[PDB]
């Protein structure tokens, strides 16, 4: 069950590339390497993005694909960022999501092996609304992988909160690999 | 110069409607009335949304159209919210914008005629990064018209900041009617 290809536009012109359809707009850009810049989502859908409308699809590790292939993430090397594996436990259950690489307001991220492994995405505001200001990751690149939803700012799976008192965490309840 | 219609999908099914193309996803919804809910933008473009792909286009005041018609805002009564006129001075010069109706984090809006008229959109963080916490509007509906861009949270033209000390304001430098 491929996503319908009649309604897909994919283009690269020099050093910007877009994979787009009626709900997704996925931009990658070349600085020194090619990398995923930002992605905008009307609504998340479960289908497979057709190879006919996929740039740079030779020899693709699906684990490297930031937007999971099960939710119409293109099976493209444009869909990558150094230091991040597929974000299957992002906050995908929301609507109107933006994915980019930038700090959540008020937060700070440190690259250090004194950090827990990948988990579900965590929102930057506690269950009662307090800001979690410090974050870490084992080997993720900066600036950090960011999701914005209507209700909050969330980090990629790699990036874990740093807490020193008892805190309730809001975490993505969904998995794109079910 | 109409936007290309080959690449447009517009549908309404019961009480949800979407106007969509390769960069825009515009959702309206019926609760008691029909109103614009949210809109997601890969990139802003200057063209006219064709009537062939426009619901509820009989007898339309272009001043009521939240997304200006000059930037491919559909000329549709779905593209409306009570208490708001067209947002021609929104922060349209950014990329990956989301428009919805919700409070900017940490802010509060009061409906009162002790308030200045419509102006350019104002970001909620001052030029040096301080949060402007209080806002007002003459006759706008709540929850308030919100833009989110990469860099900040912005309010609709109707909604003005409330300040009691000297402050530098970041304001949209663009006009969709040039």
| Fraction of residues in β-strands of chain A | 25-35%
Q: Which structural class is indicated by helix and strand composition of chain A?
A: mainly beta
Gyration radius of chain A, in Å:
16 Å
How many angstroms separate the termini of chain A?
17 Å
Largest sheet of chain A: 7 strands, antiparallel
Helix/strand order of chain A, N-terminal first: EEEEEEEEEE
Quaternary class: homodimer
**Tally of separate domains of chain A:** 1
Q: Provide a count of the helices of chain A.
A: 0
**How many strand elements of chain A?**
10
**What is the overall shape of chain A?**
globular
Biggest interface: chains and residue counts?
A-B, 22 and 22 residues
Proportion in helices of chain A: under 10%
Placed side by side, the strands forming the largest sheet of chain A appear as: 1-2-3-4-5-8-9
Membrane topology (chains A, B): Peripheral membrane protein
Site (Cleavage) (chains A, B): 176-177
Subunit structure (chains A, B): Homodimer; Homohexamer when secreted. Interacts with envelope protein E. NS1 interacts with NS4B. Interacts with host complement protein CFH; this interaction leads to the degradation of C3.
Subcellular location (chains A, B): Secreted; Host endoplasmic reticulum membrane
